[PDB]
Amino acid sequence: EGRIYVPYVTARLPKWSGSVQDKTGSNMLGGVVLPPNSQAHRTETVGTEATRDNLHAEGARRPEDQTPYMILVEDSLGGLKRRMDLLEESNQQLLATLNRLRTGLAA
Amino acid sequence: PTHDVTTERSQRLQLRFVPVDREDTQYSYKTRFQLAVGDNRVLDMASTYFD
């Protein structure tokens, strides 16, 4: 492709933070505070400063990182993965069928 | 030397100050002290620390 990352003069950084996306990141005790961006972050909310568990669409503190959310290349990456899985499933079915047929014939 | 070095009158070597105000935030702790340097004395910050 001959595409030279990265041309764009760089930012110099955010300082105040939360720059990255779907880092996910966790709180205190807490755990699971959602990747900057997403609806949960937009809404001013209360009760998350000092308490664990999930009070958002995504949660439990058990599963992370960097949640594959919305649609990026990753969604295509996630979508691509899904497609691959579907293809694999289809292949299995076919195989099974064939086998059965053979058996029958033999009998 | 036997003069113009140490004082003869009573005086602590190291004082201890207590927080005049302290706020325990969910992710931060702030405390303010009223560091008082008695007259005829000189304090060298380097000798100060937070216990």
Curated annotation (Swiss-Prot), chain B:
It is found in: Virion; Host nucleus. All late proteins expressed from the major late promoter are produced by alternative splicing and alternative polyadenylation of the same gene giving rise to non-overlapping ORFs. A leader sequence is present in the N-terminus of all these mRNAs and is recognized by the viral shutoff protein to provide expression although conventional translation via ribosome scanning from the cap has been shut off in the host cell. This is Hexon protein. Belongs to the adenoviridae hexon protein family. Homotrimer. Interacts with the capsid vertex protein; this interaction binds the peripentonal hexons to the neighboring penton base. Interacts with the hexon-linking protein; this interaction tethers the hexons surrounding the penton to those situated in the central plate of the facet. Interacts with the hexon-interlacing protein; this interaction lashes the hexons together. Interacts with host dyneins DYNC1LI1 and DYNC1I2; this interaction might be involved in intracellular microtubule-dependent transport of incoming viral capsid. It comes from Bovine adenovirus B serotype 3 (BAdV-3). Major capsid protein that self-associates to form 240 hexon trimers, each in the shape of a hexagon, building most of the pseudo T=25 capsid. Assembled into trimeric units with the help of the chaperone shutoff protein. Transported by pre-protein VI to the nucleus where it associates with other structural proteins to form an empty capsid. Might be involved, through its interaction with host dyneins, in the intracellular microtubule-dependent transport of incoming viral capsid to the nucleus. Induction: Expressed in the late phase of the viral replicative cycle.
